[PDB]
Structures are given as structure tokens and as C-alpha cells.
Subunit: 449 residues, 3 copies
């Protein structure tokens, strides 16, 4: 609906609210096929320029078939990997089934009359299937009567051009698989055109709002999808496309922005600093909160966010209390500490946080008026209403011009509650209570002494 | 001019000097256009092979137009992002203006007679514009007289081939935008050929030395540029190219190399280590120093460095004192500590730093003579004069064969000034004074006790 | 042979054994050539459609030549770089030799009669050379008799099509070099087709098992290779391909998986945690152990691993004792500590580690039976026998279905040996003995007190 934002002066952080998230929980697996011609070289003494062109294109066809066959003798073990495991295990499992005898023929028979099909494999999985290119028919009908005789017939020039056009897609598909070891992401238009992807979506056994969501964000769907080279067997080239399944829809999401909060004493080396940890995207999910620490996990389109759950953490919903009261006793809010008071800015959804320290020149400007605000040392914020850019030292930042409402939540910088002499100043992954217990230990060594 | 280098034995670091930096401060925004034909299908009963080829290519043209139109219904909200904000906000702001009524026609009128133009938008921005492909004229003149009648005329075979060539660039442009959600970087030769880029540079209202700088480093310019898909309206396909504006030129730059400095006691677990932080590129800029911590921010061509200011920090010029005296009282030099005395090497501009610990075999070699130096435990350095490679354990490193002069600055390893029993040995982001104050606190707990 | 795996309950880690490693120690350098035609424009008044097509393709040829020439005036100084130095120094050194007078002609003469050659340069390096495209002969024989007269001859339509096909590869090669500043990796099929790569391998002066290894893993060879644009001189386009040389073969390798080990007290903020550091691939190498911390350094195909030594560390073989006894006195096993008891899983080679803390729902499932195991708080493990997935909170993980045998090594979680009140709970890069000495210091402040 409406994007809103809150800046917390006390902790030098901001939350952008109002987003609606779709979270990828599963995969749709589809088998894409190219029908091939099983032909060997039938060289006949031909020297005319058009037979030579047809022969040269037929060699590129053949080398594409054999290159794919060589690629397959080394199964997709270099596909993907992580502690998160295989993103392609769903597709890989369909490939395994496809190497079973009679399975390829089962797709042959469904595609004997139509372009799209549904096939129930012998493992219980009912996959959609699609033939996107028919080379077997083209080659068997227009080119074998040319080359498979004693002396070659002469094709017309339009057959030469037409065959280069049709074969082109096989060769590009083969080029993409060859440099990516048989797994590509995003899925190119060569693997699946927009028209084929949209038809695939439209033909799936899913609700209408799931069809409409994926159809209106096809480029995000492409970027979250995989194409896995499966098998070349019995005149069939088959590869599996994994499209994202969003098992969480329209869930409330927010983004946390953080920036270093330091004291502003004039003598360098006398200053302590703190920064809230775990910036990034948060989404309500199934009674908990899903947190996405890696910036690439979530794609944003205006009001809507699309996130992959594979590299997310599941947190209690009380994690949000760190944005109402960082000292709350229900969740141990996390911070890191340092004495590195370097100046910086963070562009948020509706404004900009500025951490200005030392001698840095920090300002906010408008295109037509120039400088309209000069920041003082400390952590501060400006909204995108009437501000176009922010400058911190020698770096210029553009503020997002998205519509929405910002709220400045005044409050004492919490760094001012700490005594600089007993402050644990080099904590890389700490927490409010962890810092307070280290301070309790440092007052105790002086209490008895 | 002359690249020179200094190795500081006392802190296991080196500085390479003599570079001349250009720092990207802004953007040139240019509107690139393709003139389209607004035609719907005019199917006529044609079965001849040449009409079929023309129809098939015209469908690929149409699907490219509609794919771009679908891509645009989801505005560039997944373009780029960071705490640094939008790198494309300048281009995005031009796109917004372009969606305003009459603006497209204003580019139409400037390009009514010539290929390049200058257009002042209704927001005060005077952009250069360029038409790189004219499909409207080609289609309206050579192909509508073919297909837009009752029965189709037959084109000659050269028209089939010529149209495939002209349409190819539209389709590739469309392919690139489709997998990148409407924003690409580097800018491909499909978006802008070298000839069009060089002409664009040459035609800009900028000084001659700025023209010559960008023209002599076009591949660096390409890699620092963006192409943003704007609009398809009124037979015009328009996208905006952002080229880097170097607002700092020929500024002195240097690169800091660092390596772990450890004691060399024979019993493992008894050794302490220190490493200088903030390796990377430094450039004088506007009375301060711009520091680039991320390795990809700066491209180097021989003597010259090209850096983006977006992910840089602005430091006081006294930061350089950490290379003359790391204990100086004007700047709090930063270090990290540990007990991980693993061996490694760092290839610098003119040589190699070697940190050799434990039982590691560390040597430097020449191609023709083999091993010419054997390192002992500690941190040491060799220049590229007469050395081709360095080996540390099982890893071989090639030294850069660039011309220049190295200087070995002798000095006591500062790790030897510290008492291993009160040394803070696991500081991730500390500083000379921060370590000294932690040591003062650790001598105080024993002073009274 | 057989992949096996051991899970160490005491330290929440697992080792996957049985892999056979090939480690890249060096480079094969090969010179790839394209023979060019040194022709300037010989415009003659021609307006026929076929001369126009030939002229237009000849301009694309010419602009490709000049674009490559402009790219070369800026030598490969933006190729690659790191503290590890140039991965391409071997190739770059061949380019330098190639700019020497008479060297190009020396490759001309070897390729005067055959397609492949061996040439000894004046620096003692005997490189294999290959001509992959002959444009000089095609242009001088089929196209100069067309355009280089007073009025242009008319080519047949097959010459137009044939020349577009032959020139295409020059233009794509030029496109790839243009956006990558003259250095590409992986090496595309445009740079080197599978047939040319396999022939290059087969023709090298290396043993038969090295030929067979690289020929059976060509896509891994491609991904570990470089293509470096060298020179355009005297009708020769030359670029150098660097293929990996595996100087270590069939060496035993293993992979270390780690996960956080925390106490499981019910009150949040009262829990301490530890995690073993230095997860990743380890390989026996030359009496030491090569360790690869970066996930992309090693490619895995079933039973076999292929690693680059450039970003590896060399460790004593006693590093493996951290997998038999983490308290052993021969090697100081490394750990990091924290109070962040967030739940997670790690998919291993043959199973899954699960660290379940707080209120997280953690389970393992089978496709046909659903949930078959529910984890309790702590660190635990399940093998891939009869398990398909694992769920931790809202994230689902797929287990690898590779064949092999897992072993569960029971043992007391070592985190239970530590007193939570004197535990150093925020150590980013520590070690068993380092933690024990910090605890000794914390018992001493209370011993006297
Ligand atoms: C430190 O001691 C005070 C005094 O009892 C107590 O209120 C506070 O909660 C303690 N903090 C920690 C982290 O133990
Ligand atoms: C530690 O104490 C000595 C003695 O007064 C002083 O010279 C030094 O500057 C102190 N260091 C810090 C970091 O406070
Ligand atoms: C701590 O002290 C005990 C008692 O002497 C000793 O056994 C142990 O090795 C010490 N640990 C360290 C790391 O010094």
C-alpha cells in the first residue's frame, strides 16, 4: 500500500514499512524438449555453393548434438552448491527419472499430436512438458531428400536461410550450457522465450492469482529460475526449467537500515561507537519472521518484494522489538562496537541516514537550490521530500524519489549512556546484554579494587 | 610518471606511488533511440518461401516490441541499489521526464533531419540524443508494400537477408534488457558501438582533455557505464546511457599493500600477530584523501587509475602518516591482531611481500636460474628486478614485470615491542592507541596486584 | 572411490572423505590466430542489393579490426589482479614476445602449410599454435575480385551468406574482448570450440593420462582457463589461451563442514556458542595440506575435485588432527565464539548437520512419508539414507542423494566443558589454546580475589 519509514535517532537506524512480500518456498519443474534428427553424415560429391552451405550448417547441428552428449557424460555435479544444499535438487531428480527406460518415449507420445502436454512419470511427479523446436521434422522432410542419395539434390536458397534460422536456437542453447556446465540462471530467452514462459505459467495447475503474480513479474521470475540440461536420447533433447513457487504471498515485509552511532568528542581516539547489526529485509512468515541478510536474496518492484527462502534465517517475531526499544527484555538486540568514527551515509527507502564525524563536510541538497541542510557531528536523517542528494565528504548520494511518508523519531543517542572508559570498544558480534555483562565485569574489577 | 614503491619492514606493508587518478564524480546522460514501425499483422494468403521468411522475421520484430513493452510495465525498481543509493538516479530521472507528453515528439523533431541532436527537456536538462537504428523507414518503405495488400507481394532475396541484419540489433538489445530487468552494465556494443560511443564523447559540451581521456580508455568507460531502458511510445524506442564524468583528474594516487606481521617463536600457540588494515587505493581529492576499500572500484591501466567515488570513504590527509610512522599522534592507525601465523605472499606493484612462518618453504625465483632467495621466518620483501616468481608452500605467485623503482625501508618489526602475555590477540578492528589502552588496562590489573 | 563421511557430535562438524583431487599448479599457453586481410575501402559506384550487402559486411569486418586495434593500444593492465598477483602473467609474457619483430612472421611460416604448428619463440618457450579462421584467403580470393576494380562485380547470393557466416566469429570474438578489456574467462566456444580445444589437448607434449583427464572434463577446463587478446600485426590476429596444468593428480581430498555449537539453556542471553573455523576443501599436497577457504576455488564432479592453488593456504598435515581430537597438542585448532544461537542447517556430502536452538521447528523428511525425525535443541546430524529434505524454521534444504556411507561419531558437546561466566563469548578468530589462556587469565583475576 503506502510505503512509510521511521528513523530512530536513538540508535541511528531506520525501518521502511508497507512492502508486500512473496517468498519462494518451492519449485515448479517443467521439461523442455527439442526434437532432433538422428542422422549421420551422408556425404555425396557436391560442390555447388548451396549444398556446401547446407552441409556446413548440418555440421554445426551435429557438433552441437555431440557437444551436448559430451557435456552429459559429466552429470550436473558442478551445478550449484552451498551449506544450503542444491537449489536444483528438484530438477536433478526429474533428470534422473528421465534417464529411466521408456520415460523419454512417454514424453514422445504425449507430444505426438500437440505442442504442450502433461506427463505423469513413474515416480508420481506430473510435469508439464513443452516442445519448443522441431528439428527432426524439418531435417527429415526438407534436408534428407537433399543429402541422403547418391548425388546431392540442390536446395533452394530459402531452405538454406530457413535452416540457419531454426538451427540457431539449438546452437545458442548449446553455447549457454557449455560455459555453465549444464546449469544456467537466469533462464535466457533462448532457453524459454517470454511467450513460452507465459504459456507455461498459464497452463500450470495453480490458482489464478499465482498465475497473475508470476505473469506480471516475468523478469523477476526469470532471475529466480534455473535451466538444467538433462538428456539427449532417442531423437529428444530434454532440459528441465525450475520456476519459483511462492508459498508465501502478500506478507508484510520491512527493511532495516543501520549506520554507526559514535560520540563526538573533539580529540581523536577518545570516541566510542556502536552499530546495530542485521540490516536487511524482514518478512512475517508463518508465525515467525524470515530475515534475509544477503542483499541479492530479495528483488524489489515498487511496493512488492520477492525473496528466496534458501538463504534466510527464521527469527522470533519479537526481533521487531529492537525497533521500538533496543533495551527491551524480550529479545537480545545485537550490536557491534568500535572506535572507527568514519563518516558515511545510507540511502533508505524514503530518505537518507547521515553519520557525520570529525572534519567531514556533510550536507543535503536540492537540484534547484543547492545546499539546504548542513549536518553537524552525530547521526541524523533527512527525508526525500525536497531533498535530491546528500554529500558526505567527497561522495555524492542520490535519494530515492519514491512516494511515501517519513517519521523522525526523536530520542537520545544511546551511545551517550555509556562510560567511554569501561566500554567494550572492539566487539564484532555482540548484543546489548552481552555488552552490559562485560561492563558489569569491568565495574567489578574496580568495585573490589 | 614513474611508479615507485616502498616496503616498510617495521609494519609488513608497502606503498606503490606515482599513479594518476581519475575519479568518477558524476554522469553524462544520453538518450539513444530506435525508430520503430507501428504495424499490426496484415496476414495475406502467402505460402511462397520468401514471404514466409519475411513474415517470420516480422513476428520476431513484433515480439521484441511487446517484450520491451511488458518489461516497462515494471519500472526500473530492480535496477541497482545499496546503502550508497541508486547509481542510475540520474538516468532514471531522464526516463521520468520522457514519459511526459510531448517530450518524445521533441526528440522526434530534433532527429527529423539528422542522426545526432541536442534537446532541452522541460526539466532544464540538455541531453544529447542519437538515433542508432531506423526500422520505421526500412519497414514502411520496403516491407509494408509487400505485406499490406490483399495478396502479398514477393520480396527479393536480398530484402530478406537485409531485414534479418537490421532487426538483429533490436533483438539483441531486447535480449540483454530481458535478463537484466532493464538495466545493463557494462554497456554492450549492441547498446552502443565503439563508433557511436566515440562520436557521443566527441559531440559532448566538455573540454578537449575530457574528450581525449574518455576516448583513449573506452573499455574502462564502457565498464563504468549504464544502459537503462526508458520507454516505447509513438514509434520511438528510447533508452538512456550513463557515461562516467571524471570530476577529479590527474590526482596523485597510491596503493597500500599489507601482510601479517608475527613473532617467530618455535613453539606454536606462543606467537602474536598484527596486520595493518585498510589496504587498497588512496587518492588525493579536494583537500582530503579518498579511500577505496573494495578491489573492484578502481581500474588500473599502466600509470593511470580510474575509480568510482560511490563506494569510497573520505579521510583526512594525515591518514598517510601511517606509512611514515605508525605510532604518530596525528592519526590513529588501524590494525587487527591474531595468533594465526599462516604463511602468505602479497604481489605488489613492483615486487612481493612474503610473510613466512612455521615450517613453510618460502623462496623467490628467476625463470633462468631457479631459486635465488630463500626467506626466513618473518615478513620480508623482494623487488621485481631479477625476480619472476615467489613460492610460499605449495602456491606460486607471479611478480608484476612493470618498470619502476623499489625502496626497502629497514626497521624493527613493531610486533617485537609488545609483551606476548598482555597483548590483546584477537582484535578484529583495532588501532595502535586502542591496543595501547587495552595494554594499559592489563598492566593496571597487575600493577595494583 | 567410495565417498564416506563422519559427523563429530562433540564439535558440530563433519568431514567428507574419499575424493580425488587435481590441483592447478601451472599453465599451458597456446597462440590462437585468425588470418586477416589488409584491405582498405575500395568503394566503386555500386547500388545493386548484393554489392550493398557485401559492402555492409565488409564494414563490420573493418570496424572489428580497428576496434581490436584500439583495444590493444591499452595493454592488458586491467586484466586480472589480487594479492595473489596476475593469473595471466604466463600468457602476458607470451604476448610481449609476440610484439617482437619477426615473431609474428615465425608463426606465419609454421602455419604456411598446416592448421596446427609448434613454434619456438626467441625466449625459449615452445608454444602450440592454431589458425582457427582464415579470412585473408576468403577475402583475397572471393571478395577482392568483386570490389577492387573500377566498377564492382556482382557476387552470387551464396557468397553473401557464406561471408556473413565466416565473419560472424571474428565479430563475436571482438564483442567478448570489448566488454572484458581483452581478457575473458571462462573461454567461450567462440574463442575455442570444443573440437579445437580437444585437438589442442591431444596435440600437447604431455602424458596420456593428462590428455585423458582434461579431455573428460572439458567444461571444468574451460572454466579454469583464460583467453588473452595479444596483437594485430601483419595480417595476423593472435590471442593466447591459458589452459590449466594439474601438477598434482589423484591426491586424497576431504571437505570440512561446520555449524554453531551452543548450550541450550531456556533463558535467552544465558547461552554460549562455539563454531569451528576453516570449513572448506583440504587436499594432501607434497607433504603438507593445501586448504581452499573460498567456495569457488574448487569444482566437484562426483568423486573428483579440481582446485586452483592460487588462492589456497599451505598447512601442516597435523591440521587434520582437529577432526580426531580438537584439544590435541600438535595443532592449535581454531574456533570462533558468540552468543548468537540462531538455528541453521548445513547440507554436507552425504547428509545434513542441524543446529536447532530456541523455539525453532527442526525436522527431517522423506518424500513419501513426510516428517520422520524431529530434532531437539543442540547440534545433530542425519544421513541421506531415507531422508530427502530437512527443514529449519521456514527454510527447506535438500540433501544430496549421492551414494556413500555416513558414520555418526558420538561424543559430548565440548561447549558443555566451559563455565558460561568466564567464557570469552565474542572471539572472531580464536583457537582452543587462545580461549583456554583467556580463561586462565579470567580465573586468575578471581583466584587472587
Ligand atoms: C549488571 O548488574 C546490574 C545490577 O545488579 C543488573 O541490574 C544488570 O541486569 C546486570 N547486567 C547483566 C548483563 O548482567
Ligand atoms: C598508557 O599509559 C602511559 C603512561 O602514562 C601513557 O604514556 C600512554 O599514552 C597510555 N596509553 C593510552 C592508550 O592511554
Ligand atoms: C591454564 O593453566 C593450567 C594449569 O597450569 C594449564 O594446565 C593449562 O595448560 C593452561 N592453559 C593455557 C592456555 O595456558
Amino acid at each position: 500500500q503506502n510505503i512509510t519509514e521511521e528513523f530512530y535517532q536513538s540508535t541511528c537506524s531506520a525501518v521502511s514499512k508497507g512492502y508486500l512480500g512473496a517468498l519462494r518456498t518451492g519449485w515448479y519443474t517443467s521439461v523442455i524438449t527439442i526434437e532432433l534428427s538422428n542422422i549421420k553424415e551422408n556425404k555425396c560429391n557436391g560442390t555447388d555453393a548451396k549444398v556446401k552451405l547446407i552441409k556446413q550448417e548440418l555440421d554445426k547441428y551435429k557438433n552441437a548434438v555431440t557437444d551436448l552428449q559430451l557435456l552429459m557424460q559429466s552429470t550436473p555435479a558442478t551445478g550449484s552448491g552451498s551449506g544450503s544444499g542444491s537449489a536444483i535438487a528438484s530438477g536433478v531428480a526429474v533428470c534422473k527419472v528421465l534417464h529411466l527406460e521408456g520415460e523419454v518415449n512417454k514424453i514422445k507420445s504425449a507430444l505426438l499430436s500437440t505442442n504442450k502436454c502433461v506427463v505423469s512419470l513413474s515416480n508420481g511427479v506430473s510435469v508439464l512438458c513443452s516442445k519448443v523446436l522441431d528439428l527432426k521434422n524439418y531435417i527429415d522432410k526438407q534436408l534428407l531428400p537433399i543429402v541422403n542419395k547418391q548425388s546431392c539434390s540442390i536446395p533452394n536458397i530459402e531452405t538454406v536461410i530457413e535452416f540457419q534460422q531454426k538451427n540457431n536456437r539449438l546452437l545458442e542453447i548449446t553455447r549457454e550450457f557449455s560455459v555453465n556446465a549444464g546449469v544456467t540462471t537466469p533462464v535466457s530467452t533462448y532457453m524459454l522465450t517470454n511467450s513460452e514462459l507465459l504459456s507455461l505459467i498459464n497452463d500450470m495447475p495453480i490458482t489464478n492469482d499465482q498465475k497473475k503474480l508470476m505473469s506480471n513479474n516475468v523478469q523477476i521470475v526469470r532471475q529466480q529460475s534455473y535451466s538444467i540440461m538433462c538428456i539427449i536420447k532417442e531423437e529428444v533433447l530434454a532440459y528441465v526449467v525450475q520456476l519459483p513457487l511462492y508459498g508465501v504471498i502478500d506478507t508484510p515485509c520491512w527493511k532495516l537500515h543501520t549506520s554507526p552511532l559514535c560520540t563526538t568528542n573533539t580529540k581523536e581516539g577518545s570516541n566510542i561507537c556502536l552499530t546495530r547489526t542485521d540490516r536487511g529485509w524482514y518478512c512475517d512468515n508463518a508465525g515467525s519472521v524470515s530475515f534475509f541478510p544477503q542483499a541479492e536474496t530479495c528483488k524489489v518492484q515498487s511496493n512488492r518484494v520477492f525473496c528466496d527462502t534458501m538463504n534466510s534465517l527464521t527469527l522470533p517475531s519479537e526481533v521487531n522489538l529492537c525497533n521500538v526499544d533496543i533495551f527491551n527484555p524480550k529479545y537480545d538486540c545485537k550490536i557491534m562496537t568500535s572506535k572507527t568514527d568514519v563518516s558515511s551515509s545510507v540511502i533508505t527507502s524514503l530518505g537518507a541516514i547521515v553519520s557525520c564525524y570529525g572534519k567531514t563536510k556533510c550536507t543535503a541538497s536540492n537540484k534547484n537550490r543547492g545546499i539546504i541542510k548542513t549536518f553537524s557531528n552525530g547521526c541524523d536523517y533527512v527525508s526525500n521530500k525536497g531533498v535530491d542528494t546528500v554529500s558526505v565528504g567527497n561522495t555524492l548520494y542520490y535519494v530515492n524519489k519514491q512516494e511515501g511518508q517519513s517519521l523522525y523519531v526523536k530520542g537520545e543517542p544511546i551511545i551517550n549512556f555509556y562510560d567511554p572508559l569501561v566500554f567494550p570498544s572492539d566487539e564484532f558480534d555482540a548484543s546489548i546484554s552481552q555488552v552490559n555483562e562485560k561492563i558489569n565485569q569491568s565495574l567489578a574489577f574496580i568495585r573490589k579494587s
